[PDB]
Amino acid sequence: DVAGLTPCSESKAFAKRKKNEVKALNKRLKNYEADSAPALALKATIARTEARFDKYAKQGLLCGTDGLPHLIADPGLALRYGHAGDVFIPTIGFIYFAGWLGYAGSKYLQAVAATAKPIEKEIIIDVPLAWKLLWEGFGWPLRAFAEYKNGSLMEDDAKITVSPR
């Protein structure tokens, strides 16, 4: 109970929603024979729905007035109440992966900028170099922090074009 929300393990409307979904899928079932391919497909869909609802009740999600999971996007409020996987852990995951992709692209730009024809290397991508830099970009946070402390990550303003005010 972090903001007037109840856990979906004990909230009644979550179970009501699960029952309604399973009942609708059973209403879909009650038209085919037991061993037909549509019957197997609907049975798989039912199993997936029950597994999803049981997993959501297991993971400790919060449900509001009705049975819909709510996520917490405050560190501390999610850390001490055990919901860091709602926003905080995916925040760290996205920051890592986006930094990996962006650092790989950046290093490709600075690697092909000092070649004979940097114009050609951006439509005709050197695949081994791109693969190597994509691998090297997995250590993007340490490399980026090192280049920031070295001062080689940013460019001086006196070497950057601006408009004449």
Partner 1 sequence: MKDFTTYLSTAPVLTLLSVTVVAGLLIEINRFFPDALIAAF
Partner 2 sequence: ATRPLWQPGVEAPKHLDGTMPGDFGFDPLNLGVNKEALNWYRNAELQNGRWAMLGVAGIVIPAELTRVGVLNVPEWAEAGKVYAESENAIPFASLLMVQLFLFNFVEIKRWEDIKKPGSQAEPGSFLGFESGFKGTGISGYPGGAFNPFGLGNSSKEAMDDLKWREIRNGRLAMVAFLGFLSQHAATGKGPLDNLADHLADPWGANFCSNGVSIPSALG
Residues belonging to the binding site for chlorophyll a are 74, 80
CB of 158 to partner 1, least distance (A): 33
Is 94 near partner 2 (CB under 8 A)? no
Q: Which residues of 70-100 are buried (b: 16+ CB within 10 A; e: fewer)?
A: eebeeeeebeeeebbebebeeeeeeeeeebb
DSSP 3-state of 74? coil
CB of 132 to partner 2, least distance (A): 9
Distance CA 31, CA 39 (A): 9
Is 9 near ligand LHG (CB under 6 A)? no
Among positions 106-125, residues that touch partner 1 (CB under 8 A) are 122-125
Per-residue interface string for the shown chain with partner 2, residues 141-160, x marking contact by CB under 8 A: -xx--xx-xx-x--------
Phi, psi of 164 (to 5 degrees): -75, 50
C-alpha pair distances (Å), 149 with each of 50, 145, 160: 51, 6, 21
Among positions 59-88, residues that touch ligand CLA (CB under 6 A) are 74-77, 80
Residues at the contact surface with partner 1, assessed by CB under 8 A: 48, 51-52, 55-56, 59-61, 69, 71, 83, 85-86, 89-90, 93, 122-127
